[PDB]
A = this chain, B = another copy of it.
Amino acid sequence: PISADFSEVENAPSFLSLAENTDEVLKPYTGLEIQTIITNIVGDANPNQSRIFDQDRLRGNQYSAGGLVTQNAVSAIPFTNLIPRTIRVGNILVNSANRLQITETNVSEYYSNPIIATKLSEMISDQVKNNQFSTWRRDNTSLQGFNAFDIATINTAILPNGLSLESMLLKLSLLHSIKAMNVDAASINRSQYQVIDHNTVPTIGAPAVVGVNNSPVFGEDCGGNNPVYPFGGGTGAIAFHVTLQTVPDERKSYAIFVPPAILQATSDANEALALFALSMSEWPHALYTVTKQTTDLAGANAGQQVFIPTQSTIHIGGRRVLDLIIPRREIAPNPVRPQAGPDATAGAIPLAAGQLFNMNFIGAPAFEEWPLTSYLYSWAGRFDITTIRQYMGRLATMVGVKDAYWAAHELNVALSQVAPKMTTAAGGWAAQAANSAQQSDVCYSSLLTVTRSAANFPLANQPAADMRVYDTDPATWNKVALGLATAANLVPEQSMDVPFVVGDARTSFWERLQAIPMCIAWTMYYHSRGITTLAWDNAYTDNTNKWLQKMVRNTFSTTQSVGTIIPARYGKIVCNLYKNMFHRAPAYVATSVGGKELHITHFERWLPGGTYANVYSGAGAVVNCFSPVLIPDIWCQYFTAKLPLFAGAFPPAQGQNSTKGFNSKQGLMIHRNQNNNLVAPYLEKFADNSSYFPVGQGPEINDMATWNGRLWMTTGNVQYLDYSGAAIVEAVPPAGELPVGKQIPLLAGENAPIELTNAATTCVPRYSNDGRRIFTYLTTAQSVIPVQACNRAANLARSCWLLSNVYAEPALQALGDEVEDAFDTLTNSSF
């Protein structure tokens, strides 16, 4: 919450009390909490009436330090899943001189929720089979579409993991988030076409065109019609078998049963084989683009920019050769529909390729492999989000897809909503230049720089992994999609129990708002202890200060117990800084060591390797200091139930008292080194007895003093020196300049932020790369009013927002269970 006076800066919760464990069961963060503040929609659903195109930013009055009120001053929503591979430089479109930002997961099978053979599986073994041991009979007890010698080779030795529908449901959770950009124009913001390319105005009118393999720079049309995989040059292979006898002799264990519940006479019914073959194989199969008509700032040069979404750059899968076994009607003996296959058509795209598809091959003979990047390229303009929604409802009737899609969905939001770093400026609204690394350099919500590609596409290098995600194995999928095994995370449901995000037009708006509390929780994690940006980068193996290696060691997921993931320590600190600070729990998955079942969130599955949230200067130079700051503060304050005390709104100037500090009555002291000219704030009592941290000590979490340090570097002329006033190794901003948010184009009657209002002031540097303590200093002449404001005998004029705090309770309808519809109050006893 933002502050009305100093008596609620002072009576704000601490960090240690707000990072404690919580035993409450909390509702999921739906993204509607930020929505019902920054838009005209407070109540309920609105089809096309609510113009979300214009409602894309934080708006409010501001109050300057000089006593003036700015009327309509805006802060951008700082997250988008769209990297502009065509940049508007000099009011005209040119190709990007920048590589594409790629991520990579760490897909591996772990001990999920345990699995058990059903009464059908004990029925096949006990009866039938066991009874063929006396009758000399080799009859067929065919289950629904498969041979008895196909079920008999699967009702066998079961792996003791249990499956997690996570990788296939992130691919479904991911192509959904791509294919939901072409829904309308007044349902997708214009700010999220302007987050990186800020010299750009997209248009109401023509919607976005979600294309595939048509990006104009650095390869990236990975076979525009001769398609390969983007990660690794190769085309894969798919084969549609009717028996396991046809799978040649080599694979036969990798063979995936397509269950007959996902293909019924309810849809196109042959697109569902492509969503199944796309969920089970590999992401990405192709490099999707989003092309939209844009215009420059005044509006002359209307062209079409090419974007590439971030979730088409996430390398997940490792299954490139699929052998799919198809249900054979009711019951038939083993044999162009040889054995009564319902279908296997190619698609809708003509696809002149290496096997030369013509326009749409209908073919399910015995072996006869196709390519897989080709077979998925043909079904790349057909995957609209309504079809994905009803496919999810057909999945939900046989397995439990409610909680696993929401965990996979905020996994998508965790590694897909990606934000440009910062720019250091004095006032408000600085950005970068065009055709430069600094405009396109970009970070996660975890304050962690996204790796861009090193060489031209399709890639042979395979960069380091970023996140540990699970996967469906084919061998357990073949028996849980067939009634032969069951678990507690796999209990089936109805299509009403599909989450609200699926098949809705408002996903590109909601998913960029779900990523803001992730960066608030990581932002408050990285700012309680200020280790700049250099003592985070080369911190994993520094032989100085064993404390710092323990910090970076524990933050990441590098431990195990039995064959399963032990989640990270200190990512539960971020999770508790999410549940306490937002009163809403993030979605976990299950992992079991043995018996004991414990929970791991995207807060606990990151991996080491990679630099952190850097800040740039006005001329593009690196200012690796402060702390890993991303989005501007007011996001890390206003949209918050309980923000810890060191991060706080400087309260408005009401009477004679505006902004004060914390003095030696709270256990603090002034540093006051060698020279008489520069003095430091009221830091801790340990600050004068250190000067360099001991090899197992770090910055003590004091929010009286971190407040009191950002209270001094808001003055506008500070230097970040030393215990003795000497320089540091770290790059310092050129003046009294702070990291400030990204500037987007304005509208009519709508202003830019004024002075340290769209800034990030909380990033107080306290721990240099060398292990020495960083002190913020002022001249003796220019520190009298800050020292007396700490002593409550003066006041400091600071700028603020003129908003008020509401923070409503959760709705739990979210446009996803509108079961009030009159035709099921009467079909209600039958459920």
Q: Which residues of A contact B (CB under 8 A)?
A: 2, 4-5, 40, 42-43, 46, 48-51, 61, 63, 69, 186, 651-658, 660, 663-664, 669-670, 672-673, 676-677, 679, 800-804
Is B664's CB under 8 angstroms from A42's CB? Answer: yes
Whether B676 and A2, one on each chain, are in contact in the complex, defined by CB atoms closer than 8 angstroms, is no
Q: Is the CB of B679 within 8 A of A40?
A: yes
19 additional contacts, CB 8 Å, given A46-B672, A50-B676, A61-B658? A2-B656, A4-B655, A4-B657, A5-B655, A40-B670, A42-B664, A43-B664, A43-B670, A48-B676, A49-B672, A49-B673, A49-B676, A50-B672, A63-B656, A186-B676, A656-B800, A656-B801, A657-B804, A660-B804
B652-A656 in contact (CB<8A): yes
- 21 A-B interface contacts by CB (under 8 A): A4-B655, A4-B656, A43-B664, A43-B669, A46-B672, A49-B672, A49-B673, A50-B672, A63-B656, A69-B653, A186-B676, A652-B656, A653-B802, A654-B654, A654-B655, A656-B802, A656-B803, A656-B804, A657-B802, A658-B802, A660-B804
Closest 7 pairs (CB-CB, A-B)? A51-B676, A654-B655, A652-B656, A49-B672, A656-B802, A49-B676, A652-B655
Contact B677 A51 (CB under 8 A): yes
Chain B residues contacting A656 (CB-CB under 8 Å) are 2, 4, 63, 651-652, 800-804
User: Most chain-B CB neighbours within 10 Å: which of A651, A652, A800?
Assistant: A652
CB-defined contacts of A651 to chain B, threshold 8 Å:
656
Which partner residue on chain B sits nearest A51 by CB separation? B676
Q: Smallest CB-CB separation from A664: which chain B residue?
A: B43
A650 to chain B, nearest CB (A): 11
In chain B, what residue has the closest Cβ to A40?
Answer: B679
- In the complex, the count of this chain's copies comes to 2
Residues of B within 8 A of A46 (CB): 672
Dominant secondary structure at the A interface: loop
Q: Which residues of B contact A654 (CB under 8 A)?
A: 654-655
A2: which B residues are within 8 A, CB to CB? Answer: 656
Report Cα–Cα, A656/B653, bound state, in Å.
9
Q: Chain B nearest CB: distance from A640 CB in Å?
A: 16
Closest to A69 in B: B653
Q: Which residues of B contact A51 (CB under 8 A)?
A: 676-677
Q: How far is the CA of A651 from the CA of B654 in the complex (A)?
A: 12
Q: Taking the nearest CB of chain B, how far is it from the CB of A188, in angstroms?
A: 13
Q: Which one of A42, A658, A660, A670 has the greatest number of beta carbons of chain B within 10 Å?
A: A670
> Could you say which residues of chain B place their CB within 8 Å of the CB of A43?
664, 669-670
- Which residues of B lie under 8 Å from residue A660 when comparing CB positions? 804
Residues of B contacting A658 in the complex (Cβ-Cβ under 8 angstroms): 61, 802
Beta-carbon contact of B802 and A663 below 8 Å: no
Nearest-CB residue, chain B, relative to A655: B654
Contacts of A679 in B (CB 8 A): 40
* Residue on B nearest A63 in the bound complex, by CB: B656
Contacts of A672 in B (CB 8 A): 46, 49-50
Give every chain B residue within 8 A of A676 (Cβ-Cβ).
48-51, 186
Most buried by B among A42, A46, A655, A669: A655
Q: Which residues of chain B come closer than 8 Å to A669, judged between CB atoms? A: 43
A678 and chain B: residue at smallest CB distance: B51
Closest to A60 in B: B656
Contacts of A677 in B (CB 8 A): 51
Residue of B nearest to A649 (CB): B656
Shortest distance in angstroms between A800's beta carbon and chain B's nearest beta carbon? 7
Q: Which of B652, B655, B663, B673 contacts A42 (CB 8 A)?
A: B663
Closest-CB distance, A70 to chain B (whole angstroms): 12
For residue A189, give the distance in angstroms from its CB to the closest CB of chain B: 14
User: Measured between alpha carbons, how far is A640 from B673 in the docked complex, in Å?
Assistant: 33
Contacts of A663 in B (CB 8 A): 42
CB-CB nearest in chain B for A800: B656
Closest to A46 in B: B672
- Residues of B with C-beta under 8 A to A673: 49
Chain B residues whose C-beta falls within 8 Å of the C-beta of A801 in the assembled complex: 656
Residues on the B chain within 8 Å of A42, using CB:
663-664
Q: Which residue of B lies closest to A3 (CB)?
A: B656
**For residue A655, which residues in chain B have a CB less than 8 angstroms away from its CB?**
4-5, 652, 654
User: With A and B bound together, what is the CA distance between A672 and B652 in angstroms?
Assistant: 35
Q: Which residues of B contact A50 (CB under 8 A)?
A: 672, 676
Shortest Cβ gap from A73 to chain B (Å): 14
Residue of B nearest to A50 (CB): B676
Shortest distance from the beta carbon of A1 to any chain B beta carbon, whole Å? 11
> Chain B residue with minimal CB distance to A43?
B664
Q: Which residue of chain B lies nearest to A48 when distances are taken between CB atoms in the complex?
A: B676
Residues of B within 8 A of A657 (CB): 4, 802, 804
**Nearest CB on B from A671, distance (A):** 10
A186 contact set on B, CB distance < 8 A: 676
Chain B residue contacts of A800, Cβ below 8 A: 656
Note all chain B residues with C-beta closer than 8 A to A48: 676
Closest chain-B Cβ to A187's Cβ sits at a distance in Å of 10
Once bound together, how far apart are the Cα atoms of A658 and B670, in whole Å? 37
Q: CA–CA, A655 to B654, complex, Å?
A: 5
Contacts of A804 in B (CB 8 A): 656-657, 660
Chain B nearest Cβ from A795, distance in angstroms:
14
Closest Cβ of chain B to A664, distance in Å, is 7
Choose among A186, A669, A676, A804 the residue with the greatest number of B CB atoms under 10 Å from its CB: A676
Which residues from chain B contact A49 at a C-beta distance below 8 Å?
Answer: 672-673, 676
What's the minimum C-beta distance from A40 to chain B, rounded to whole angstroms?
6
- How far does the Cβ of A38 sit from chain B's closest Cβ, in whole Å? 15
What's the minimum C-beta distance from A50 to chain B, rounded to whole angstroms? 7
Q: Which residues of B contact A4 (CB under 8 A)?
A: 655-657
- Considering the complex, give the chain B residue whose CB is closest to the CB of A654: B655
Residue with the highest number of chain B CB atoms closer than 10 Å, among A651, A656, A657, A804: A656
Which one of A40, A49, A669, A802 has the greatest number of beta carbons of chain B within 10 Å? A49
Name A804's closest neighbour in chain B (CB-CB): B657
Residues of B within 8 A of A802 (CB): 653, 656-658
A58 CB to closest chain B CB (Å) equals 15
